[PDB]
Write a protein that holds these residues in place. Structure first.
Motif, PDB file in Angstrom:
ATOM      1  N   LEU A  53     -89.146  42.414 118.640  1.00 55.50           N
ATOM      2  CA  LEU A  53     -89.413  41.324 118.165  1.00 55.50           C
ATOM      3  C   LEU A  53     -90.439  40.498 119.292  1.00 55.50           C
ATOM      4  O   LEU A  53     -91.006  39.653 118.774  1.00 55.50           O
ATOM      5  CB  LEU A  53     -88.073  40.369 118.113  1.00 55.50           C
ATOM      6  N   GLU A  80     -94.080  38.640 118.281  1.00 56.59           N
ATOM      7  CA  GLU A  80     -94.210  37.362 118.591  1.00 56.59           C
ATOM      8  C   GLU A  80     -95.578  37.291 119.262  1.00 56.59           C
ATOM      9  O   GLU A  80     -96.341  36.478 118.977  1.00 56.59           O
ATOM     10  CB  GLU A  80     -92.997  36.548 119.473  1.00 56.59           C
ATOM     11  N   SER A 112     -80.956  43.151 105.855  1.00 54.83           N
ATOM     12  CA  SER A 112     -81.689  42.574 106.955  1.00 54.83           C
ATOM     13  C   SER A 112     -81.334  41.282 107.350  1.00 54.83           C
ATOM     14  O   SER A 112     -81.502  40.936 108.680  1.00 54.83           O
ATOM     15  CB  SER A 112     -83.135  42.725 106.447  1.00 54.83           C
ATOM     16  N   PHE A 113     -81.337  40.547 106.298  1.00 52.08           N
ATOM     17  CA  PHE A 113     -80.578  38.943 106.645  1.00 52.08           C
ATOM     18  C   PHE A 113     -79.432  38.973 107.635  1.00 52.08           C
ATOM     19  O   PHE A 113     -79.308  38.481 108.686  1.00 52.08           O
ATOM     20  CB  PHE A 113     -80.654  38.354 105.429  1.00 52.08           C
ATOM     21  N   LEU A 150     -80.373  40.273 111.268  1.00 58.92           N
ATOM     22  CA  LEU A 150     -81.175  39.310 111.689  1.00 58.92           C
ATOM     23  C   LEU A 150     -80.179  38.161 112.453  1.00 58.92           C
ATOM     24  O   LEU A 150     -80.374  37.531 113.353  1.00 58.92           O
ATOM     25  CB  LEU A 150     -82.311  38.902 111.222  1.00 58.92           C
ATOM     26  N   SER A 151     -79.254  37.637 111.368  1.00 57.97           N
ATOM     27  CA  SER A 151     -78.918  36.377 111.675  1.00 57.97           C
ATOM     28  C   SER A 151     -77.676  36.895 112.657  1.00 57.97           C
ATOM     29  O   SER A 151     -77.408  35.825 113.576  1.00 57.97           O
ATOM     30  CB  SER A 151     -78.010  35.924 110.467  1.00 57.97           C
ATOM     31  N   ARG A 184     -79.775  37.074 116.104  1.00 55.57           N
ATOM     32  CA  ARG A 184     -80.156  35.745 116.762  1.00 55.57           C
ATOM     33  C   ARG A 184     -78.822  34.663 116.823  1.00 55.57           C
ATOM     34  O   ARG A 184     -79.270  33.544 117.091  1.00 55.57           O
ATOM     35  CB  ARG A 184     -81.212  35.279 115.909  1.00 55.57           C
ATOM     36  N   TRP A 218     -86.550  32.647  98.156  1.00 56.62           N
ATOM     37  CA  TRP A 218     -85.282  33.175  98.503  1.00 56.62           C
ATOM     38  C   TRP A 218     -84.348  32.985  97.273  1.00 56.62           C
ATOM     39  O   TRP A 218     -83.907  31.932  96.731  1.00 56.62           O
ATOM     40  CB  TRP A 218     -84.457  32.617  99.726  1.00 56.62           C
ATOM     41  N   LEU A 254     -80.284  30.817 104.380  1.00 56.41           N
ATOM     42  CA  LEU A 254     -81.643  31.311 104.990  1.00 56.41           C
ATOM     43  C   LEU A 254     -81.916  30.253 106.095  1.00 56.41           C
ATOM     44  O   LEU A 254     -83.436  30.147 106.673  1.00 56.41           O
ATOM     45  CB  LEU A 254     -82.884  31.268 104.056  1.00 56.41           C
ATOM     46  N   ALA A 312     -80.165  29.334 108.862  1.00 51.50           N
ATOM     47  CA  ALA A 312     -79.728  30.006 110.077  1.00 51.50           C
ATOM     48  C   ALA A 312     -81.120  30.572 110.987  1.00 51.50           C
ATOM     49  O   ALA A 312     -81.202  30.198 112.326  1.00 51.50           O
ATOM     50  CB  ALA A 312     -78.825  31.008 110.164  1.00 51.50           C
ATOM     51  N   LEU A 313     -82.028  31.255 110.106  1.00 52.55           N
ATOM     52  CA  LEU A 313     -82.947  31.951 110.771  1.00 52.55           C
ATOM     53  C   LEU A 313     -84.464  30.811 111.014  1.00 52.55           C
ATOM     54  O   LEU A 313     -85.383  31.369 111.228  1.00 52.55           O
ATOM     55  CB  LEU A 313     -83.496  33.088 110.270  1.00 52.55           C
ATOM     56  N   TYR A 361     -87.417  30.326 113.944  1.00 50.99           N
ATOM     57  CA  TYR A 361     -87.767  31.575 114.415  1.00 50.99           C
ATOM     58  C   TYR A 361     -88.994  32.314 113.547  1.00 50.99           C
ATOM     59  O   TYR A 361     -89.327  32.055 112.472  1.00 50.99           O
ATOM     60  CB  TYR A 361     -86.669  32.525 114.130  1.00 50.99           C
ATOM     61  N   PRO A 362     -89.635  33.179 114.391  1.00 50.62           N
ATOM     62  CA  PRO A 362     -91.012  33.917 113.717  1.00 50.62           C
ATOM     63  C   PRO A 362     -90.558  35.068 112.565  1.00 50.62           C
ATOM     64  O   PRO A 362     -91.362  34.760 111.559  1.00 50.62           O
ATOM     65  CB  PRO A 362     -91.427  34.667 114.809  1.00 50.62           C
ATOM     66  N   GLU A 363     -89.521  35.642 112.766  1.00 51.49           N
ATOM     67  CA  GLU A 363     -89.078  36.636 111.844  1.00 51.49           C
ATOM     68  C   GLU A 363     -88.681  36.264 110.428  1.00 51.49           C
ATOM     69  O   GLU A 363     -88.409  37.196 109.793  1.00 51.49           O
ATOM     70  CB  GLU A 363     -88.187  37.789 112.496  1.00 51.49           C
ATOM     71  N   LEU A 395     -88.913  38.089 105.516  1.00 52.16           N
ATOM     72  CA  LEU A 395     -88.059  37.829 104.410  1.00 52.16           C
ATOM     73  C   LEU A 395     -88.472  37.352 103.090  1.00 52.16           C
ATOM     74  O   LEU A 395     -87.606  37.296 102.326  1.00 52.16           O
ATOM     75  CB  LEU A 395     -86.686  37.219 104.849  1.00 52.16           C
TER      76      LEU A 395
END
Ligand SMILES: [Zn+2]
Ligand SMILES: [Zn+2]
Ligand SMILES: [Zn+2]
Ligand SMILES: [Zn+2]
Lengths: 63, 1480
Positions: free
Chosen positions: A28, A32, A54-55, A58-59, A62, B1195, B1201, B1203-1204, B1207-1209, B1213
RNA sequence: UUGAUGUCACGGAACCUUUGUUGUCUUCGACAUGGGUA
């Protein structure tokens, strides 16, 4: 392209391994940095697969 | 005795000060302390505390006095009155204890031996030095000796750097404290003198004190005889009460922009439709209300207080958002004075950064009174730089050591200049800058910063003094001053972007000779004319003009003029001004301010930063010590070119244009995609003008390779390849010419078969003159979508790819409508006129871009670019699994229900029941009945046919009351029976005690009351339960008389304003006395019909069954309530409306009564009433293949969505794993610039109107025409159910026909009745067929197959056409496109003609299609069928059906009977996907 | 708040590098509404 490597890390990732955690953090960070400094890698216009998993991963990472 | 002498200092400039240091550090070893000793000190009362005041040491004054005494002594003769005045002693063997040593050359007047160390008498100079306390200088503190919190209270720190002449970049710096003179001008002290001192020494001391002129780095004359934080917290709390958190930075920027005047708060922008619901200023109390209160507060009425308040608000919000030699010279001396004014011709930027101001990256230097400053240090540095440039020799000096002796330093050790300030005090403006990624063509990640800029036109005072032994000024100084007077004065920083050009005006000078005695004694008396009165007196004795140097070297910079010709709209974005301007638009142009006196003047211009970026990008693409670095500079070296802002000749005023995005499926406007912008107008008839210039060094000009690079780049810019501004994709910023004057033709020297016909179409469609067709169908896509992972970058002109222009011509086959929405009352009933710009009929390029994109996306099987993925669908129920219940974590259940009359003149439950239990809060005890008994005294001689014996009692008003003991004593009951002929006539004379047989039937009769009626006092239980009052909601209103109202007798009654006091008037079925109906009268409605008289009552409440609620059910119920609330077709009177829509319920709550259906464990759906809507669980985006959804979309899956966020990533999604489809690769997406640009179309010949105008003398204006109603597209027709078999059919397309003839006549296309004027319909100005338009398209880095398919989509075939404009369903707007020429680019110089490669490009496109889809191409045939234009002798009839057949005089079917026919739910998709399918 | 026979600090430009840009046809037909009868 770091996106493919991040996908590989995610699909293989499990959160009990500090090795996996540091590998994913490095990927990551590599993505960046490539985003901040302009380069040819910014022409990769794709995303990740398996959106729910994936969600969730990632959640969990982070947070 | 020891008589004293008071002294004072009056500072004419700001002075400098040194910071406090610890005692042990005050030694010879410390570097900073030794670097002090020339600035003022700072006192501390307590060592730990910072309290104290400034002061000046006496040794510094002693040194200045000694220096001036030596100067006077070498000047006159060394004879003060008559004495020798020996040179004195300045040497000793004990150099270990001293703190500093002299490094300058001591002066000389005589060659004699200095006097003995110990002698009888000493000369006056030796008395002044002392060496025996004859003279004691005292320290100077202040008047009254006040105290201050710290050094920051009276002054501010600043940074001073040192540059390298070779490159122009700093490498080191030092800090210091500066104190303003307007606040602390006066100091006081005293001097002690003994009585034995000689009068000659006293006179020398007096003369030297009058001669001292600079102390502590400043000119001097010596004489001797709350709401901010509160409002911030309020606004922040309000934004947090909402969820408008992304707007914090924008709001802070807008607030800081508002600082100029409080009147801007009154003229703040509002939202569309004139309502105060702006997405920024009406987030709420509201932000607008708060700003108005703070504005009209008395204490904040003051201008400066208002300014400070706004700045503090901005700072707080931004913080939250981030969170010994003895050499002689001589007695010759002159003092030359020069005066003038330094006017600013461009903006300027003197950098000075404050630690407590983080919002702005780059800040300017200001005084405590907000006035602009021109620092002495900057003026001295610029003078040194110019002198070094003149001599063509850098000074290789270093700090410390002996003085230098180069010519520049010798000239500079005679110079004195004055610090200056201006009267103008308005706030500075702000500018924004970005960095562009050359690969994608969009901005980089996090590349944003601000810049403060001072305006132009400010005037400063200027004064320069030269003291030297020459006859006058040096030739170098004369040449430098002549350069400054010409306008070659570049003083401030950021010179590359065009900041800091000044001019010197009204120059005067005079020479003074301080060798002559009288002149010297006049200079000493007047103190050198330093004070204001002395300066005025000197100004009365000044000659105008300036000298003329002998060896005049020409300047180093040369001016290059620029002129640009532009024939299209122009815009340069500025979001903040759009966020505060009263126009109310989304994007606004750039405007700067010119300072004239004390008032500004708005003027529009083009930014020098943008122009520099464009030219640099042009240079870098057709070609560290590289050429780009050498010419444009870098982070290690300064540049050699300087641009400036370009201004327009005859000042335009902006216009407004509206835009809207169209959905690919529904064919209507996409929600939350309506916007507009404000560009300056431009057209070929009256194009725009731009004027300006840029500067370049001569060394660059005398380099052939650099001149060649610049010429190539400017030639490319001139050949339409590089547009200026933004939004170039829709025809903005198209340059037509570019001039370059004033270069001796060094850069300007370099700047200097017919198309085949279309192929015929093979598509065939059979049309019959008797049938009726539908006005739109769908095209089914293919399963496979090709995606490429690596698009082509913008960083160069790749080989194997084509670039050039395409020119086309557009023809009208049917009447066209393209309205101008600026004015909606051209002719309530809205009216519009045709699009225009400077009185010229035009079509915007966005329309044509969308039209061509819609066909390109269909040809190349691609994604749905525009699509509302998050929409949710709903359907009405039709008159089983929904059970009653009550709400929470689980939901309760009931077993049975029963009806309760409430709107009949029989029950009167309002007089009894309480409001709380009507609402359903409290339980009620009611009386339910389940079955009724129905006798027939004679045997059937029914379906169940039970038996018994009757016992007559009496006969009332008709009827028959009697008890009946059925089954011979088993069961008994009373009732009433009407006369049934053929059975009742047997008993007409009653006996009061006679018994007869009877047969009984049972009928389901489920009702409930609170008191049993008079008729049926037997067989009535009493059970508990709740009530479900919803009010009168079943209503059937229409335009005019129906059938039931037609049978009503007499005038119908009035309306009650309350929903409780309604009762029935008349039954529908009078014979059977059933089906109650109600009617009422209002002013203009006149037709209401309510057919409800029973309510619902649940009972049999259980305690065991409990079912968890899911969030999916919750959101579904939320959508259901939203759909109920937002209903344009709702009944007018609220009494005839259900509770959820009358009380405007929004969210579910506990204790409410609702129906539901359940699985084994959880609940699935909830509704408020019996017959209600069903809401789809999945969104519309999930009802289609994942490969057809947009590549970069939204989405849809279960997840917030959020929470992210930050952030870059998170962006990964929302993108497809396989890359970009061909349409997104060609036309671009949100993170990728496109490779095609469309242009505005213009009418060639004179217009031809559909309807002749009222004035025969005005052929440029046409008459009006009235259209029918235009209502929204409905997805539910195409998706008629919630089952999974239904999917999105495809892309909508409208067909060609001639229905517009009936509308021109004035009749409705469907019915043939006259059109009714109303507020709903529209009137438009339309053009007739036969007109022609011309436009242009430009591409860049395209492949052969892409270019071929683009040409195909432009000019498909003969017999096909596109659809443009509005009213497409009525037959308006069929157009045909034909290509005229195809230019291409090979090199910067050659541009060939590419008219002889279209067949090859088309063939390659078809080959690519074949090699993507293995010869199936069904969507191709469907599209060609839909684009088919009917030929002559063929008049199809195409129109929508009516709602019912009785409303259609033609006798055709309607929707209600068509649903239960050909278009049932199972074959609707198949019949809609087939082009040209009749329906009548 | 200073020492005394020695102060070129008017002995030192906060300077140099970055396009408010990218993506969007002012477009358009099928309902709405909850019960009623035995
Ligand atoms: Zn002496
Ligand atoms: Zn030097
Ligand atoms: Zn370079
Ligand atoms: Zn796509």
């Amino acid at each position: 392209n770091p996106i493919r490597d991040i996908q590989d890390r995610l699909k293989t990732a499990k959160f009990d391994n500090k090795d996996d955690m540091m590998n994913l953090a490095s990927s990551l960070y590599k993505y960046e940095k490539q985003l901040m400094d302009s380069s040819e890698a910014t022409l990769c216009q794709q995303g990740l697969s398996n959106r729910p998993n994936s969600f969730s991963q990632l959640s969990q990472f982070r947070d | 005795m020891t008589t004293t002498m008071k002294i004072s200092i009056e500072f004419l400039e700001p002075f400098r000060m040194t910071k406090w240091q610890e005692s042990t550090r005050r030694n010879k070893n410390n570097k900073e302390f030794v670097r002090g000793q020339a600035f003022a000190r700072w006192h501390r009362n307590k060592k730990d505390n910072t309290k104290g005041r400034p002061y000046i040491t006496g040794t510094l004054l002693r040194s200045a006095v000694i220096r001036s005494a030596e100067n006077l002594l070498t000047l006159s003769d060394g004879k003060i009155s008559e004495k020798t005045c020996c040179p004195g002693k300045f040497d000793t063997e004990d150099k270990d204890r001293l703190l500093q040593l002299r490094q300058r050359s001591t002066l000389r007047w005589t060659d004699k031996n200095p006097c003995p160390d110990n002698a009888e008498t000493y000369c006056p100079f030796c008395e002044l030095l002392g060496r025996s306390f004859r003279i004691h200088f005292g320290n100077l503190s202040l008047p009254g000796k006040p105290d201050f919190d710290g050094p920051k209270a009276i002054g501010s720190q600043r940074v001073l750097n040192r540059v390298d002449f070779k490159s122009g970049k700093a490498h080191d710096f030092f800090k210091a404290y500066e104190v303003d003179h307007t606040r602390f001008p006066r100091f006081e002290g005293e001097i002690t003198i003994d009585n034995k001192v000689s009068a000659e020494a006293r006179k020398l001391l007096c003369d030297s004190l009058k001669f001292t002129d600079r102390l502590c780095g400043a000119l001097c004359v010596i004489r001797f005889d709350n709401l901010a934080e509160k409002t911030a917290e309020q606004i922040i709390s309000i934004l947090d009460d909402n969820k408008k958190t992304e707007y914090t930075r924008l709001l802070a920027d807008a607030i800081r922009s508002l600082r100029r005047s409080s009147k801007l708060v009154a003229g703040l922008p509002k939202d569309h439709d004139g309502k105060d619901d702006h997405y920024l200023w009406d987030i709420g109390v509201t932000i607008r209300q708060i700003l108005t209160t703070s504005a009209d507060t008395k204490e904040l009425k003051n201008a400066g207080k208002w300014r400070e308040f706004c700045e503090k608000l901005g700072e707080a919000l931004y913080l939250k958002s981030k969170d010994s030699r003895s050499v002689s010279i001589g007695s010759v001396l002159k003092e030359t004075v020069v005066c003038g004014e330094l006017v600013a011709k461009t903006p300027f930027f003197f950098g000075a950064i404050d630690e407590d101001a983080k919002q702005t990256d780059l800040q300017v230097l200001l005084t405590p009174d907000n006035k602009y400053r021109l620092p002495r240090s900057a003026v001295r540095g610029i003078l040194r730089r110019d002198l070094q440039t003149y001599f063509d020799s850098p000074c290789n000096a270093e700090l410390g050591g002996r003085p230098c002796m180069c010519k520049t330093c010798r000239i500079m050790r005679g110079i004195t200049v004055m610090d200056a300030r201006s009267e103008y005090n308005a706030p500075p403006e702000i500018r924004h800058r970005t960095r562009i990624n050359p690969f994608t063509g969009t901005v980089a990640e996090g590349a944003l910063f601000n810049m403060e800029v001072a305006p132009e036109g400010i005037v400063f005072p200027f004064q320069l003094r030269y003291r030297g032994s020459e006859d006058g000024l040096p030739d170098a100084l004369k040449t430098v001053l002549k350069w400054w007077a010409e306008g070659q004065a570049f003083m401030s920083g950021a010179a590359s972007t065009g900041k800091g050009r000044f001019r010197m005006e009204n120059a005067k000078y005079e020479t003074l000779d301080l060798s002559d005695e009288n002149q010297r004694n006049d200079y000493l008396k007047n103190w050198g004319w330093r004070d204001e009165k002395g300066l005025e007196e000197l100004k009365k004795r000044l000659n105008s003009g300036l000298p003329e140097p002998g060896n005049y070297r020409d300047p180093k910079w040369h001016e290059i003029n620029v002129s640009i010709e532009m024939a299209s709209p122009f815009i340069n974005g500025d979001p903040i001004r759009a966020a505060v301007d009263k126009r109310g638009t989304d994007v606004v142009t750039f405007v700067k301010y010119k300072a004239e006196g004390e008032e500004a003047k708005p003027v529009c211009a083009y930014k020098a930063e943008s122009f520099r970026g464009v030219i640099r990008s042009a240079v870098a693409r057709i070609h560290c010590e590289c050429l780009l670095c050498q010419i444009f500079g870098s982070e290690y070296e300064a540049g050699k070119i300087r641009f400036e802002d370009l201004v327009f000749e005859s000042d335009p005023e902006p216009v407004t244009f509206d835009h809207v995005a169209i959905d690919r499926f529904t064919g209507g406007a996409a929600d939350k995609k309506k916007f507009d912008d404000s560009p300056l107008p431009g057209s070929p008839a009256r194009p725009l003008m731009l004027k300006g210039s840029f500067w370049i060094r001569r060394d660059v000009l005398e380099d052939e390779e650099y001149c060649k690079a610049l010429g190539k780049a400017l030639a490319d810019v001139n050949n339409g390849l590089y547009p200026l501004g933004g939004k170039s994709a829709i025809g903005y910023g198209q340059v037509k010419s570019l001039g370059i004057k004033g270069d001796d033709k060094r850069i300007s020297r370099l700047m200097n078969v017919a198309v085949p016909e279309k192929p015929k179409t093979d598509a065939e469609v059979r049309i019959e003159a008797e049938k009726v067709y539908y006005p739109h169908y769908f095209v089914e896509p293919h399963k496979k979508v090709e995606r490429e992972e690596k698009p082509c970058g913008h960083q160069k002109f790749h080989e194997g790819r084509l670039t050039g222009k395409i020119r086309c011509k557009l023809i009208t086959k049917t009447p066209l409508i393209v309205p101008d929405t600026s004015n909606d009352d051209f002719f309530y009933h809205k009216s519009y006129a045709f699009f225009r710009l400077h009185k010229q009929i035009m079509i915007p390029g966005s329309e044509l871009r969308g039209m061509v994109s819609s066909v390109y996306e269909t040809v190349t099987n691609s994604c749905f670019r525009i699509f509302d993925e998050t929409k949710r669908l709903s359907w009405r129920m039709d008159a089983q699994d929904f059970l009653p219940g009550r709400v929470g974590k689980h939901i309760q259940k009931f077993s049975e229900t029963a009806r309760v009359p409430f709107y009949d003149k029989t029950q009167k439950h309002f007089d009894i029941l309480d409001e709380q239990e009507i609402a359903g809060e409290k339980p009620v005890r009611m009386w339910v009945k389940r079955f009724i008994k129905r006798l027939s005294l004679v045997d059937p001689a029914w379906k169940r046919r039970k038996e018994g014996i009757a016992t007559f009692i009496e006969q009332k008003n008709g009827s028959y009351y009697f008890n009946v003991v059925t089954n011979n004593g088993c069961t008994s009951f009373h009732l009433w029976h009407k006369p049934d002929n053929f059975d009742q006539e047997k008993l007409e004379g009653i006996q009061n005690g006679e018994k007869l047989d009877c047969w009984v039937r049972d009928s389901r009769y489920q009702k409930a009351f609170q008191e049993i009626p008079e008729n049926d006092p037997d067989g009535w239980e009493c059970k508990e339960g709740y009530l479900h009052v919803v009010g009168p909601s079943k209503v059937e209103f229409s335009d005019k008389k129906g059938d039931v109202i037609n049978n009503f007798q007499g005038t119908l009654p009035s309306v009650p304003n309350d929903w409780k006091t309604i009762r029935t008037n008349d039954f529908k079925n009078r014979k059977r006395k059933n089906e109650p109906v109600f009617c009422c009268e209002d002013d203009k409605g006149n037709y209401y019909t309510m057919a409800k008289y029973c309510e619902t009552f649940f009972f049999d409440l259980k305690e065991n069954e409990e079912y968890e609620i899911p969030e999916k059910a919750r959101i579904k119920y939320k959508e259901l309530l939203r759909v109920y609330n937002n209903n344009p077709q709702a009944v007018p009177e609220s009494v005839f409306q259900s509770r959820v829509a009358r009380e405007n319920v929004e969210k579910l709550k506990s204790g409410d009564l609702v129906y539901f259906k359940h699985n084994e464990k959880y609940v699935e759906d909830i509704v408020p009433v019996r017959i209600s809507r069903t809401v789809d669980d999945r969104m519309i985006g999930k009802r289609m293949s994942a490969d057809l959804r947009p590549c970069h979309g939204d989405w849809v899956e279960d997840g917030d969505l959020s929470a992210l966020n930050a952030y870059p990533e998170k962006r990964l999604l929302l993108r497809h794993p396989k890359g970009l489809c061909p349409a997104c690769r060609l036309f671009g997406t949100g993170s990728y610039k496109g490779r095609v640009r469309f242009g505005f179309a213009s009418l060639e010949n004179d217009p031809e109107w559909l309807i002749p105008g009222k004035n025969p003398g005005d052929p440029f204006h046409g008459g009006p025409v009235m259209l029918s109603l235009l209502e929204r597209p409905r997805p539910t027709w195409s998706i008629p159910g919630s089952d999974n078999k239904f999917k999105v059919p495809g892309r909508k397309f409208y067909v060609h026909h001639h229905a517009w003839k009936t509308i021109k006549d004035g009749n409705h296309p469907t019915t043939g009745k006259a059109i009714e004027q109303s507020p709903n319909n529209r009137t438009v100005e339309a053009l007739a067929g036969g007109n022609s338009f011309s436009f242009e398209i430009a591409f860049e880095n395209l492949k052969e197959w892409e270019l071929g398919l683009l040409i195909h989509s432009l000019q498909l075939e003969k017999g096909l056409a596109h659809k443009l404009g509005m009213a497409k369903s009525m037959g308006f707007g069929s157009v045909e496109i034909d290509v005229e020429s195809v230019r291409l680019r090979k090199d910067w110089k050659q541009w060939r003609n590419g008219n002889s490669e279209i067949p090859n490009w088309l063939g390659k496109g078809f080959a690519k299609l074949k090699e993507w889809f293995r010869d199936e191409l069904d969507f191709i045939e469907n599209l060609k069928k839909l684009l088919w234009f009917p030929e002559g002798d063929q008049a199809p009839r195409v129109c929508y059906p009516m709602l019912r057949k009785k409303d259609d005089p033609n006798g055709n079917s309607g929707y209600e009977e068509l649903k239960d026919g050909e278009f049932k739910k199972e074959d609707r998709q198949k019949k809609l996907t087939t082009p040209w399918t009749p329906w009548a």
